[model samples]
Each structure stands twice: as C-alpha cells, then as structure tokens.
Target chain A: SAVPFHGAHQAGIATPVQDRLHFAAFDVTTEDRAAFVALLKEWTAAARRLTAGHAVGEGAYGGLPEAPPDDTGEALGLKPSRLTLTIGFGPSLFTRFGLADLRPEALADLPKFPGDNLDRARSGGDLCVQACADDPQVAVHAIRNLARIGFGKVVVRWSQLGFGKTSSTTPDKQTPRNLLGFKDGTRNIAGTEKDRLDRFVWAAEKDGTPWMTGGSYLVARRIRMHIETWDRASLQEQEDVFGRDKGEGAPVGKAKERDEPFLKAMKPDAHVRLAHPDSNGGATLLRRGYSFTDGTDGLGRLDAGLFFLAYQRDIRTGFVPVQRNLATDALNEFIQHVGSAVFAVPPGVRDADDWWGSTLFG
Target chain B: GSAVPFHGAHQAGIATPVQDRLHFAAFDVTTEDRAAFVALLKEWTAAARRLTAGHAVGEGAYGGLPEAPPDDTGEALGLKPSRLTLTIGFGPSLFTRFGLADLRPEALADLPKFPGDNLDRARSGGDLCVQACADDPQVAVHAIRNLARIGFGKVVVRWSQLGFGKTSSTTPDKQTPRNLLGFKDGTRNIAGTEKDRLDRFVWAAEKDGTPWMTGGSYLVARRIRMHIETWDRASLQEQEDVFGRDKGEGAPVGKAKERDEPFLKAMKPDAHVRLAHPDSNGGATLLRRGYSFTDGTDGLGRLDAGLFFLAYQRDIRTGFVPVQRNLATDALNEFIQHVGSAVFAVPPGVRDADDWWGSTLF
Candidate 1:
C-alpha cells in the first residue's frame, strides 16, 4: 500500500504508522537563503517519487555516466511499503538564513525538564525529515538519498534508525508494546479521527500562523532506559510504575486495556495517570514513537530506550505541559531524556510543481 | 502464516528463508561454574522454543507471580511468531569459560585479522551468540531482550546488532534485496532451496575433522561500516565498476539479467563480484545471511550504517578466512571498513524435547 506524498497535511503524522523509521536532522551549511530553500524543493520532489515507490532522477543507473546517479539504487526493485516522508523546520534554522521572521512561535526551544541529561552534540537541528516505511531499506534509502541531495548545502547533524516501532494486524486485532514490556498506544489518534485532529493536531490560522494552518508542531525526545535495572524490578513494581498490567495492559483495577482508567486509583506517580489528558489540561499528543538500541552503555548495559515523537497544534499546551507533569513520574527513574528537539512543520505540497516549505518561503 | 521448524538436523536460521528483521547479540559469561552456565543454556533453549512458536517462555508472562519478575517480558505478548527463528552459537571464548576446550570444535577458531580492519574490541568476540530473526522487529527484539533477561546474572551482552534489511534471500524471491550502497546485494548468494549447495557450502559433514561439528556450521559476522557519503558522491560509472553490477537491474557486468553468470574478465581487476566470487577462491563457498544496519550517527556527522555481513559455512579456513583475504584488494573496500567481527560455532538445532542447545558438545 502506497501513501500519498502531496496533500493539505503530511501523511506520516496520522497515516497508519509503518514498522520502520529512519529519522534524520540536518544543519544548513550555507548562509544563502535561496540555496537552503532550493534544497527543500529538491527534497520535496524526491519525497514525492520515493513515496510512490518510484526512483529519482535517472533511476539509479540511467544517469549520465560521468556524474553521480540522481538517485541511490539500494531502494530499487522494492515496494514503497507505505513510505511517508515528513519534513519539519527547527528553531535554530530561524537564527540562520535571515528567516527569523518566518519562524512560528510554537517551534520555540523545549525547556530542560527535570532528570534531563540532554546531549548537546546530538540535540537540535536546523531541519529534520521523518522517513517511515514497512521495509527498512526503503526508509533508509529515502533518508540517505535526501541527505546526499542536500550535500554541501545541508549536512546530517544526527540520524536514527528504529524497527518494530509498532504493528499492524489485519486478520486479528492486537496492540503494540514498548521496550519496557508494556503495551503502548492502547488509546491514541487515528487518521479517521478528523474531529480530534482539527481540535488538537492541525494548527489554526487564527493562532497567528496562517502558513502553518494545516501543519503541526513536532517534539522529538530521545529517552534512554536503565534497561537492566528495570528488568530486575518485580512484576508488580514494574506495572505500578506505569499503573497498568504488563500482560493485559489494563489500567489499575481494570480488566481490559481499553477500559476507561480510574486515574485516581493508580499510584500517585504512575506514568499513564500523570500523562493522561485529564492531568495535563486535556492536552493529548499524537505519538509516533519507536524503540532503539545503540550498542551498549560501555558498562555492560543496553544503551537503549524509546525515541518519542509527538504532534500537536501547539507545543506550549501539548507536549510541554504533559512532559512537565511527567517530571515526577515513577517512570522517570528508569529513563532519562538525553536528546530533545522541536520543529514547525509547514503545510504540505498540493500539486506536482508545488514544494515543501513554499508556504513559509514562497 | 507459515512457521519455520525449530527442530532440525542443522539450524533453522541458516537455510531458512531470510526474515526481514534481525537482533543478533554476543554475550560474555560471568559465572565461573560450568553447571551454572549449562543451566542457563537449557533455560534459554526452553524460552526460545515457546518464543519461536509465538508462545511465552513460562506461564505466558501473565499467570506468573506478580511479586516476582515475569517469566516472559510481555512485550511480544499479543505478537504472533512473525516467522521468528532463534539460532544459538558458541564462541571461542566460551571454550575457555568452563573447560569447553576439549569439546570446542576446531572449526570454531578465531577469525584471522583481515587487512584494513579497524575492528573495535568492544564489538568483537564474545562467549556466546544468539541470532534472532523475524518478519516483525518487535518480535525479534522481544525474543532477544527476554533471553538477555533470563541470562542476566550469568551473562551480560557484549555487543548487539539490530538490522532491518535482509542482505540475503534464502528463497528465490522475486526481487533481490539491496544494501546501503544502493546496489542489489547477495544476488548470487546461495539459496536455502539449493540442498546440495547447502550441504557442500553451509553445513558440515561427517567427514569434517571436528566430530562435534558434523551437523554444525561456523558463523563469521563482520560489521562492515560503509562510507555512504563518499560512495554517494562517486560517478555512476565508478560505482558500477566497483561492484561490477548494473545498479538498476543488479546484473553482473556484460549481463542483462540478475542471475546471469558474470564474466570475470569483463569486470574491473578488483571488482567486488570478481574477487568475492567462489571461483576466485579454491572452491571455498559461503552461504550468506547478511543484514543491513543503520546505527544512528557516528558523532562525526556521518551515518554509522552498513551491512552486517553474516556468512555460514562448513569451515572458516576455506570459507570466510580465505574469502576475506581475497577481498583485501576489492575496489568496494575503499568505501567500507570492518568495524566489528565475531566467529561462532553454531551446533545442530534441538532434535528432541529433552535435547537442548550445546547438547552435541556437552
């Protein structure tokens, strides 16, 4: 199944989540505004073809022999695998290329929350592109090729590859689980929930950013887990940390995962209770998170955790308040936010000739 | 919805059709008692059995005591098998761990140092290894994480590699999978369906010197980190010349179809295909089961991505050792480096309900 690349809003946010993710953040290498703008257009063109399962430029081998092929060939003969490429602009981009005036208020820097051990070297980027696909190679090829296309004009600041982020069950229904051995997304946004999308996910023109009316704000957090420590925790203690049954994913004292949670019945510092909308001014996020492992922690421990991505109309009332509320969550002891980033996603390209960032740069 | 048989003459992973995702881990044994280590092996095999069948290890992670750590971790609770396969192996270090030297197969020797190798010690040799493959990453990840938990006190993970793209297809799949270099990889690799080739190249025979290795195979894992940016900038002609394969169709030089036999002389002197061909060695052939890995950034602004080269053969002396020596002159080597390496002797699978991993040796 192929995902549409061009539309009023990006497809990755609400489109059915893919099994693999290749997320990259880049920094502008040139001070020329037009040069950076052209790169965005070039990326948009590539994204359009890639999502349709088509090759770029000379199609990997037909390009002039004297030059690099217009596209990388690794994704050749592969399905699109429901690939979706979503672009976002970070706050740091506004500080460069004289584009400060165009930066949206919602893209402001994320606050350093408690228990944060943010790695400056891997944090923040001028721009980011989230590439998700059922086939990991397609997603990796999409990101690498785009990074290649932005050569000299933009450089990859950091990149991450995640697999088994979630799941899709057709014949039988099922829920996906996180690295912590607990079911995730028992309740979350679906693309068909347009009512909630308008109320929370998509930006409003009246919010003072007309160009971003159909777009959304993105918050990326890299959480590293104390995996070995948590693995040793008692089953009861582990479930209490999240205030949910590990096996059924049911809320405290509930029999089913989908049963409405009695927030007050959960432990005072339960993760889900603290993260629930009722506890954070009804601010709920549309999450697209994935699990990741980066070798070992150099001390015989797994250097692994979740890469959490959330979309909302406003970060101020969305991820900000919820994360702030989670500052004291029992879940915090076993995890630390090591990297943080925020981006303003502009409205999507509407036609073949139209391009990404046109609403803000045109 | 087919299931790969876990009980076999050799192992399930080697000749089984390649899965889409991999979680390969090497571990260090911390226990000094040989009996303790043997018990862990039985525990791991017991868990692997249920996991491969889409069931939990003990009590299904639900009926267990709440005050105790769940027998199963629960991440893969509702997840199907997803064609999951768990293959276990013993490293050279394991022979020294518990007086296993007498039982160590001569074929399980340390891989000889390859030319231009920048192998990181931390990611290299280990006491034991487990290869988990599945169509869904979460299933694969869940299997490995649960085993790691089960063996927590006895052993610790030395290094792990999670790969999403299959570099080799054991089946005669319609499309040849590609590597990070944007070129079709393992097009000429040995297929699982080729029984004769599997016997001659992948599985050890009774005539083999190592009696314990009669039905076993040696595994060589090379973490080849590709300089993707450098390769991406090369001229299309140069890229093609290095691999001696057409980028689009993956045909060998002077051939129109992918499966067409390659004319070695028509390719460059150091072309990858020309050197890696079994013809180049003294009839030394290998059954490749490689996977592509993208492990975030190198912290130097470059992607730490490449092929996790996995080869299984009857003997490393003629298989990986000589083939790797021949590849010293490979043109493709200019853009790739071996950063992590390991070799293990994978014994035959559990033949009966009472049999466990390493039963052939112990």
Candidate 2:
C-alpha cells in the first residue's frame, strides 16, 4: 500500500526515499481566484486517490464511453509503491490571489549565488509538486493526472524526471551517490531526529508566519556536472576534490564512511570541509535529491547531473549560508548550477475535510 | 544474481530479459587510426566482461596505484551485477573512415528521414553505440561512464539516453511495461527463447550481406517525444481509438485477452497498433527492446518524455522501414514526434576471451 497521504507534515519530507521521481513546477494560468482554488481542491482529490493506488473517479474501466478515463491506465495493475505527492506554494503565488499580506518574509526569492548560470525555463514556478514512488510509472502517473486536472488553471512551468535517488532521509539505508559518483547525504537530518526536525526543518509560529507555522521551505537546483572533465582527472585528484575516498566514501584521513570527518585534515578548498556544518554556523537541511541525465547538450557533452532538493525551516540559516560558504569549493570546477527555484511547502492535509493549500486559500 | 554471459552466439541485450534501466550512448569517432580504434574496442570488451561478471576493472577501484585514475568508477562496488549486459554496434559512418566501406552491411545503412521528424543533428547519427542494461540504474550508468572515460581521446559522446521502466519485455512470463502515453506497449514482441523466430526475424544469414556481418543484426534507434500535455487533454475514447486497444486490458479492439488476435477491421483506419502490426506490413517483424525516458522539460515547460525505441532485425529493409512507413500516418503520430534516429550493425558476440567487440571488423 502507499504511504498515507494525510498527515501533520508532507509524506515526502520524512518518508523513506523512493527509487524514482517525477517533479513538476507550475505557473497559475487563470486570473480567477475561485478557479485556482477549485483546481487545488480537484488536484488534492486526485492526488489522494492516486497515492492510495486507486484511479481517479470511476477509473479507466467501467467509465462512461464518451468521457476520458479518470486516471491514466499505465499504472493500472501496479502496486502503490509507496507513492508520496507533496505540494508547495512559490513566492510568486503569494503576489497574486490577494494573499500578499499573508506571505511569510521567509518566502522571498533566493539570493543570486556565485557561479550560478541558471536557465529561466527550468527555474521558479508559482506552484510545485514533488512526486516520489518506488515505481517510476506510478510517480509519473500521479504528476500527469494532476497536470491533466489543472490544465486550465495551471500550466507546467518546468519539470524534472529523476531516475535514481541521490540522498536518503532514513539513517539505516546506505547513502546514495550523485552523478559525480560521491556518496551524498552522509550527514543529512534523519527523519527520526525529532529535535533536528523541530529546530531546523519545521516552521514555527514564532517565525512570524501564522499560515506557514508547520510548513517548510523547499529549494531546488538542477546542477549539471561536467562528467567528461571529471572523468579525465586522476583518482587522487578526484578524491581530493570531494575530500573523501571514492571507494569507501570516508572523509579525509578517516577509515570508515560513518567516522566523524576531520575537516582540518582536508584541503582548504575541499567540498566536504566547506559544506560541513562546523565550517558554517550549524546550518543543516533535510536533503532529498535525485540524479538525472537529460540526453546530450548540442556541444557533444552529456547533459547529466543532479536535481538537488532541500527542505529547511528557513532558507536564511539553512541552504543560503551553506551555499555561500561553498562558493569557493573545489567541486565547483566540475559542476555548473544551471537551474534553480524555491517554494514554501505548507503543512500537510489534516483529514478528509482538509485540502492542499486550504490553510492559505481560506 | 546470475550474470548474463558476455560471450555468446549473439549479443545479449537484444533478446535478454528486459532490465529495469538503460544507459544507451552514441559515440562519434575522432581518431583516424584504425589500430587505435580497434585497440579501444578490445579494452572496452575486457571492461564490459569484468563489469558483467560483478568484478572491477584491473585491481578494482581501491587496489590500483594510489596516484593513477581508477579503471572502474567504484559506484557499483557494493552492488551486485544485477544481470548487466553490454551490447556494442557499428554505425554507417564508421565505414566512411578507416577504409572499411567495403565491410559495411547493406542493412546497416543510415535510416531514411521519415514524415514528421524534427530530428536534431546532434542527437541523430553516430559512428558507434553501446547499450548497457541492468536491473540497477547505477550499475548501468557506471558501465557507460567508464566506457566513455576510456574513449575520451579517441571518441566523444554524440548523444546518450538514460531510460527507466523498460517499455518492452522479451520473456513470456514478464508483464509488458507501459510507455509514457500510459499504454502497455510491445505486448506482441518476440520472445528471446523462441529460437526459430530469432533465426527468421533477427539473425542475419551468411548470404544476407558482408561476410563480417554473418550472424549479426541491424539496430534502429529512434528518440520519440510524446506531446504529453496535449495527449492528457484527449478524452479516454479518443486515446483508446488512437491506440486501437482497451486501456485497462491492453487488448486489441473486440478482444478480451492481450494475446488474442487484434481485430484489424474493427480498428480505425489511422489506429497505431493496426498500422504497426506485422499483418498490415506483409509480415514485417522486428524484435523490440525499448525503454521509457523523461529528459527534463522543453523550453516551453512541457515534459520531454517518450520512448527510446530500439529494434533489431536480420535486415532493416524488411524490419523497421516498412513498419515505420505504415505508422507515418498513425493517429498516435499527432501526440509523438521522432527527434533522433540512427542505424547500426551489431556484430555477432565474442566467441571467447581472445575475441573483442570488433574482432570481425578488424
């Protein structure tokens, strides 16, 4: 069965990482506030049905002959595969719908970071949905159906299809590798860490936003790796670039992966050293990223890299400061920050009566 | 956990049980030295053998010289072989160089431009290709990345596709998978265990073409882009009408079971299955091994999701050409565009450790 869609926080945030992802960002197309709200309600209903492994409405079979099937039939006999659909509101969404006053200050646009070469087409959207499932078809089906239902109200701004997860939230699972072939999320905030969740992942009323009290901020960056260049470098250079052994993924001067990193032993510009919390002001994020390979660029190089997704209580002290600290990291030479976006993920639906964005829409 | 034999009468991927993931790469040869190119093929063959056997290249990623680059990238260190298979092919362009035009098989000529093709030159023709398939994506990707690394100075990546959730099954017991259009595809595919079918439709006879191509086959790769948003807006009846099949059962119109005979007369004139069927094209048949791909988003924010279509045959003239010509006017064509095309001659598999991928050519 699928993970329960109704909960205090979004299922994708703390749930065990799935094997596949189909994430989409949308721009609200309709000017009518009521129409937009209605679309949200309809989308929530469809998502709830999908996550539970049921088709929307009457489903593909036994449906009226003239009407389209309620759900795409591709995933008909497939298991739920622990599907999770988490929705979020972008800062631009608040500017419309007469909700500007309700927008939290923390929902502002991300500051332009050094060495960023972001493409607008793959950037910010007014609304976003992160769909993850053990089966790729199920995740793609969930996003496709939602996009279908929101056809008139919202248009897809950008979407990413990630085949393999790069990070895991569960502590017991083995850490996965990014496109750069290094173990990522070695020290991610674990789902079981309640204290870290409350302090670093969840928003609070004291943060000056009533509507977003239980919500978190989402940051997405499509980082393109120059694999051909990276592949040419020596093994020692590659290890030095990431400040970890390639085979064991141990930190510099360490023997095992879980061993505490001796940051001082690494080069001054090493990636692991700069991104470590000790190098910054104790900044941490709940990371959920996936790897993507988008065919090839016109210039004869693979358009392959990572779709970096991070959620934090606030971007100010989380991704922002940490990214700023890593501006001069050695890993930057082999990667380019190509696409980016940020969204404010509201609290999850409370029960049958609750709908996505109901807290802000009301 | 059993490994597919790398050396066999024929290449493994074509008729092997379809893996869950694919890393297909097309390369453009940069070197004019025939010896150098042949040397690279030998190197690739050795590496492919080690990888398929769940062993690392040379001394493995850790045991090699500390200062030199690791032969294997080490991402698949802890993972099993996952039934990985690497299949190699030579494209038409390869013969133009190296004074080997006399060796090119007639069936290995370039694919003719079809109707409604928006083909990108960068993604189209190549001098060679390597298809890596595995149950685990990381293992498949590692194989291709290492191959590309080894071919750095001699060849460059012309284009590549990372595919998940294979769209075709070559075994009777395996359930057919769906394409991005939410329909079960390639349900009538030829099974790997059918020796007679392979001899009739797949393997090239000694008298078919060049001596070097005896027992070999021709491969056609097409990157088909699905107009997902437009297709999603279509009604269920219209969708079914385009495919000429029931959405839930994947049965041909007027049929109950998927394996039942398709009612050709009952289908619409422009129906996809009707046009693609061997019955409609003078019994033209090809063994398909396609996989679904979602390559991020187009500039207009639409998903670039579709099928990385692969088909193998004794002779392409009797295989893909006639069938594709019939499908040029398929009703489903409105929702899909052919963006990339290539044709290659896949030589018979290596006979032993001393033979390489291009032993026949050399």
Candidate 3:
C-alpha cells in the first residue's frame, strides 16, 4: 500500500537534499531480535527494489567503526554513528516506568504508523528518532517506509547531530539546524574555544572513551515548538527574544550586525528580557537548535511544531543545568518539554579495519 | 475573573483562531504602573461586567439582529457553557525592563497568535481562550449573538477538534488518532479558494454576515456518527432511508445527480425502497464543518465519528447549528449527539483589523 512518508539526511552540505528520508531504528528486542533485524534488512532490500530509482542509505548514529593502529584521531573514533531513539512514558504508557520486561506483543506493535490500528499499550509511548544518511533521497525513502511500516510514530528531523571532528580538519564543519540555518557550536569545551578544540585530540592521555577518544560529546534535545503561536509576534519582539535578528543575526539593541551590546548596561525598558543577565542568574547556555514541521491536520493545516536538537559535552555543566536556571524564565511559558532523551555518541569511523560500534557500551 | 485590561503593552484578545478556546488580556506596566496594572487585572473583570451588562443585551438590536454591539450590556445574552483556562507568559521586560539586546531565542518563539495566521508573521507572547460547549442550544445561540453584539464580532461557531479521532489506527500519541470516517477530517479544506482564505473579506457573493462578518466564517458542527452495527445490518435500500444517499454510489435520495435529490420520486414503488419507507422523522442536513472524534470506550466498546461537523457561512438562519435544529428528529439523529459546542468571534485579518482584535468587536 502506498503511504505518505518523509524524512531528511544529515550530510554536512548546505542544501543537502539528502536530509529528507524515512528512517527507522529500534532495539531488536524480540527473542527474535536477530530475526527481526534480518527481516528489516530484507524489507530494506525490498524497499530499494520497489523504489529502484530512489536512493537509500542505512547506518546507526553510534555504530561507526573503530580506528586503525596508526590513527591519531581518538576524538573521531569515540563518536557513535548509529541513530538515537528517545522514548518518554507518562501516565499513559502502562502503570509503571522503566520496566524493560519483554512484552513481545507490546514491542511488535510499536512501529505502527499514524494511520495504523494497534492496541493501546503501544500508543501511549511518545518517542523521537534521529536517523542520519548520506543520500537525501535515500534517507527520505527510508524514513517514509519506516513510517509506512509503522516503525514507531515518526517525526524525522534534518540536523547536525554532532560527533567529534576528524584528525585532519577542514572549514566544512558547519552543522545544519532545522531551518537550514548555519549553526555555530555555541558552548563547546567548558572554558574556551582552544580548550574545546583540545578535547578532540585522539591521544590515549585524553580523558574520554577509547572508541570516542577524539569525538566531542553529543546530547540531543527533542524540543517541540509552537510555530503558529510564535509566528504572531513582531519582528522587533522576536529579535529581542533571540537576542539576534533572524535575517541578519544582529544583536537586538545594537544598530550594527557585529557589535556586541552591553548586557549589564541594558535598561528595564528594553525588549530583551529573557536573554538578559539577572542578579540571581546570568546567561550561560549556548543554543544551536533545529526546527521541524510535520503532521497535517487536513486542509493543508499542520499539526506542526519545532523539533529542537542540540549537542554539548556535559549535561549538568551545559544544557540541563542552564535550562533548569531558566525554569521560570520567559521561554518556559510558551514551550513544553513533551519529549526527552540522553545518549552518549562515540566518534566516527577512522578506517575499515576497525569494526563499527566496537566500543558502544563502553 | 477580574475586569479584563482595557490596554496593554501587547494587543489582547483570544490567541490563535484554531486554538481560540480561551480569552486573554495583557497589560503593559511602567515600573511605576506595575503594581496598579496587576491590581487592575485582579479587579477589572467584575467592573467591566457590571458596567456593560445591560449594554450587552441591547447590542443585539444595533445592526438589527446579527451584528456585534458597541457595548457589553446591550449584548447581555446569558452566558452559555463557558470554560476558563488560564495561562501566563514571562515578561523579562516586565520584571527588569531590559532592552532588546537581552532577549533570548526561546522567548521569541513562544509568543501568542492574534488576528490569526493571516496578518502577522511574528508571534507575541500572551494568554489564550477556550469556551465550553453549551447544553441548552438556545444559550449557545443567544450568547454567540450577544458576544457578536458586545465585542465578539464575526462569530465562528464550531465544535472541538477532539471530535475527529481516527478509528482504524491507534496512534501512540492519543491526541492524533484518525477518525473512523475512513478519511481524515481536515484532509482538504477551503484554503486556496477566495471563500476560504483566512485573511480575506467575506464578500456578499460568498458570505452573508452583513458588513461586520464580511470575510468571517461561521464554523458550526453537529456530531453525527453511524451506528455501524445497525447500519451494517440494514439492506442497501434501508441504509438509504437513514443517510438519504445510496450506500455504494453516495447519490442523493432518488436522483442520480450528486446534489439533486428527488425525494418525491422515492415515494413511487418503481423508485428506490427508501422512497417507499419515507418517515415523518425529517432528514437532517447541517451546514457543517466538524471534524470527527472518538470518546475512546471505557467499559463500553469504541465510539467513533458519530459525525463531527462544522459549517461556515453568515446568518445563523442560513448556517449550520440552525440546520441541525431543523433536523432534530431526522432518522440520522439517532446515530449522533450534540456534545461539545462553542461560538467564537474570529477577528478580521491583520491588515484588515490593523491590530489584534481591532475588528468591530473590539
């Protein structure tokens, strides 16, 4: 049966059309986990045959291969390549939380698409999956089929789920946010840019996982947005909240694009309150987020929102702690934390000799 | 409910047309006026009500019978089933009076929608509105009329979105389950057309709401679901008796044309069986625009799109709810219920109204 499927790829290209694909990943939990994986592999092959002209690429985010003996980039080796799947269960997902018991029936039904009929057990679990592929078309096809086959209620986001850089570096390091906006890694290594760069060294002395020694830490935040509501504010007001005008990325109070405003000297009359430094707390977190638009409520009307994805080294020192301080902050009023998950991404593949995801658990 | 603020830093009214289920107010405060504004909001609801009660009742006569009134008293139609849901946005500017340079991105995206998606591309942060369904249909009718008279100009009467719940599939997110109608409720709506554009005027040729509701639509729906079991048992001919349309062809009562129904021909023995079994129980046809909904069965079995309908036009005489009243005892009525209903004044488009809720209602 033909179904409506969509997704995106994560190549570093500016307009990587590969960003859209139907991609699906799940923990093979059936005692027939291996069997299911095989079935999936066959399905992928069948899908490729069906859409012969369509592109297809499949690999996990943290499942990249290990490094060679002569390789010096430990940071690149630590980053995982397999896709990450985050699930959140509330009052609706059964009576308890975190029970890993195998309910084959429950697990089997989890992948049903938006229009499939399944039991209630599978419906209550809210999840967000990030799949990365090389070819944009292939990614979109996989994601679509993943949706068509009911591989969990899906929302495919196109973004740079960053792992550490390679031993040999280049200027082509920009991450693609949801809106295709250039995302500069805001807050990297704790103290400085130099310190952040140093964290990417593959040396054995570095304080990091062997497989991920050269890789930078990866933390994904699945932030759902209220686009319809956000679209109503004035540009000036919007500029104030973001602290930078969207079009030019200029500071709100400053006339020039590059000039930094005196945050401490800002007056109470200014439009920038949410990002301002307070007596009790100051601005600390860096935001490199993406936007996603999905789920049509008929009439071309969208049941849409942003899927915010960001990565940083330390959850406590970086993302969570900062968001916690801003708990009662102005931003919390409009957005809700409907989905959340944490995963440790290892470095990229150094060479073919090293097997993929060799040190994932470590 | 304090007297709603008459003025504010940001424009005030119900937030988004789609989510326009609640009313909201925002008051700008100078450092000196902060205490006073908060207090005023606390006390304003009663004050505004007392001052305008009589005027609300009289407003119904202003534009003859249907237009919005200038004051609250002349529009005093007693309240229908109404629900008040309160929400608040953080004001960095309100608390510290910071300049625009201090604003954050999170705050920028969390604003509210006023004047709808048509006018502003920017989102302003604020509260919202969600009115309850009326049991006494008269109360809803009068209240809507009164609201039109007092300030809710360009009324839009429709049922809740929950009405359309998917039947065949169980979505992990219960909120999005598809309805049993086999087709999605909002699959295709009035968008590209001039009559359906959210921002344009309701010209006399397309709509009949006088000058005030010129471009506005009256969204009305009467919940009607088929008793599938009973329907399944009925012969094709009998099915036509209840639906007034051929089951296989979906043609009207007697005539082959889609819209042309030869109710008289059905009376002849040579005509369809439905004609011979005509009933005093009138056939019901609501000017509808409703989406389907499922009350997910409790101890009882599943209850699906017992039809969720919404209709838009101008005068109540020519619009939906009235048609529903006319069909009160129709054969189809046995399969449906009038559960949740609301009457809202969707404000004019942004350019049309100048500011949020600046239409004649304001």
Per-residue error (Å), model 3, residue B345: 7.0
Off by over 4 Å in 2: A165-172
Per-residue lDDT tens digits for candidate 2, residues A280-349, read 8799888898888766677767777889999999988889989999899999999999999999999989
Q: Considering TM-score, where higher is better, how would the candidates rank from best to worst? A: 1, 2, 3
- Please tell me the TM-score of chain B in candidate 2 relative to the true structure's chain B: 0.98
Question: Chain A TM-scores, all candidates?
Answer: 0.97, 0.97, 0.49
**lDDT of model 3 at position A168:** 17
Error of 1 at B209 (Å): 2.0
* Best model per TM-score: 1
Q: Give lDDT tens digits, candidate 2, residues B123-204.
A: 8889999999988777888888888888888998898888877899898777878787778887898999999999999998
User: Per-model i-RMS in Å?
Assistant: 1.9, 3.4, 24.1
Which of the two, 2 or 3, has more TM-score? Answer: 2
What TM value does model 2 have? 0.96
Model 1 per-residue lDDT tens digits across residues A11-50: 8998887888889999888999888888888888888889
lDDT value, residue A29 of candidate 3 = 22
Candidate with more favorable, higher TM-score: 1 or 3? 1
Better of 1 and 2 by TM-score: 1
